[model samples]
Target: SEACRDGLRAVMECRNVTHLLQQELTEAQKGFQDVEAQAATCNHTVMALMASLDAEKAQGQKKVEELEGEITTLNHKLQDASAEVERLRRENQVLSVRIADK
Candidate 1:
């Protein structure tokens, strides 16, 4: 009869263990669902960042193009200034030569 009582006690302990296992399983499933939702949100945030980077790259390219055009205009202006300086120097030399001939 003592052995029978011990066996009954063991069964009673195991009954609560089953319920605890079921509760732990339910909590683990809910945690997994929350992790899946968080993963989706992170993916969306990454996509938005990529889009913003792409837009910024396009704007930077446009600015580089505009700077190239400005450089080309400055080069043309430099060429014109160089030709004017050469012409003025030649005129001055010619006037000096005439004054010496006098």
Candidate 2:
């Protein structure tokens, strides 16, 4: 009979359990909010890094185009120089033959 009375008291103390459950629920909600905040922060950082990489890619492409134009101009100048040198060589040969005949 005494143990049965103690069990009844234990069952009747559920108001404390209700309050404890509410406190645990509130803490779980706070932990969920913290995780959400961290996710947002990580998302923003990744977006920023992607934008920076895109800008760098554009800059690198532009530099490659400028260097290609410079190479084309240099090739044209080399062709002109080669033609002038061939013309000078032919003139030198003609002058030497005329001097030898005299």
Candidate 3:
């Protein structure tokens, strides 16, 4: 009869331990869910920032290309002007020689 009573006590202790463990498991799951939510929020923010940075980089690249095109155009104009100056100088020299011969 004492052995029967001890068995009953052991069953009760086991149930109490199980209930405590279940509560702990529930709390741990809740904490993990909170962390997961926070990580998702951070991920979204990082993605937004990365998108903004990429857009800015694209804009900068476009500006650089435009400036390069302008430089190329200006260099061509300079070359044309230099050729004109050389032609004028040669014409002046020829006129001076004819005058000296006269």
Candidate 4:
């Protein structure tokens, strides 16, 4: 009889353990679904942000091109001014030599 009682107690403990495992499995499944839902939301948010970033990147690129164009124009003007100054210096040296010879 004691042996029978021991067998029954062991069976009961097994059932309790199985019930706890099942409960935990259900909880884990719920947590997994919640995580999946958040992942889906985050994916959509990431796509929207990426699209916005592309637009801003294009605007920034346009600004860079405009600034580069301005720099090219400024460089050309500086070259022209430099040439004028060199010509004037050469003419001044010629005039000084002529007056000294006279």
The lDDT for every candidate, in the order shown, is: 0.99, 0.97, 0.99, 0.99
For each candidate, how many residue pairs have backbone atoms clashing (under 3 Å)?
A: 0, 0, 0, 0
lDDT of 3 by residue, 1-102 (tens): 999999999999999999999999999999999999999999999999999999999999999999999999999999999999999999999999999999
RMSD of each: 2.2, 2.5, 2.2, 3.9
- In terms of TM-score, which candidate is strongest? 2
1 versus 2: better lDDT goes to: 1
Q: After superposition, how far is residue 92 of candidate 2 from its true place, in Å?
A: 1.0
* Candidate with the larger TM-score of 2 and 4: 2
Report the CA-based lDDT of candidate 3 relative to the real structure: 0.99
Instruction: Kindly report which residue pairs in candidate 1 clash with one another.
Output: none
Per-model TM-score on C-alpha atoms? 0.78, 0.79, 0.77, 0.62
Cα lDDT, model 3, residue 65:
100
Q: Across residues 1-102, which tens digit of lDDT does each residue of candidate 4 receive?
A: 999999999999999999999999999999999999999999999999999999999999999999999999999999999999999999999999999999
Native-to-model Cα distance after best TM-score fit, residue 3 in candidate 1, in Å: 7.5
Residue 32 lDDT (model 3): 100
As for candidate 4, its clashing pairs are none
Candidate that beats the other on lDDT, 2 or 4, i.e. the better one? 4
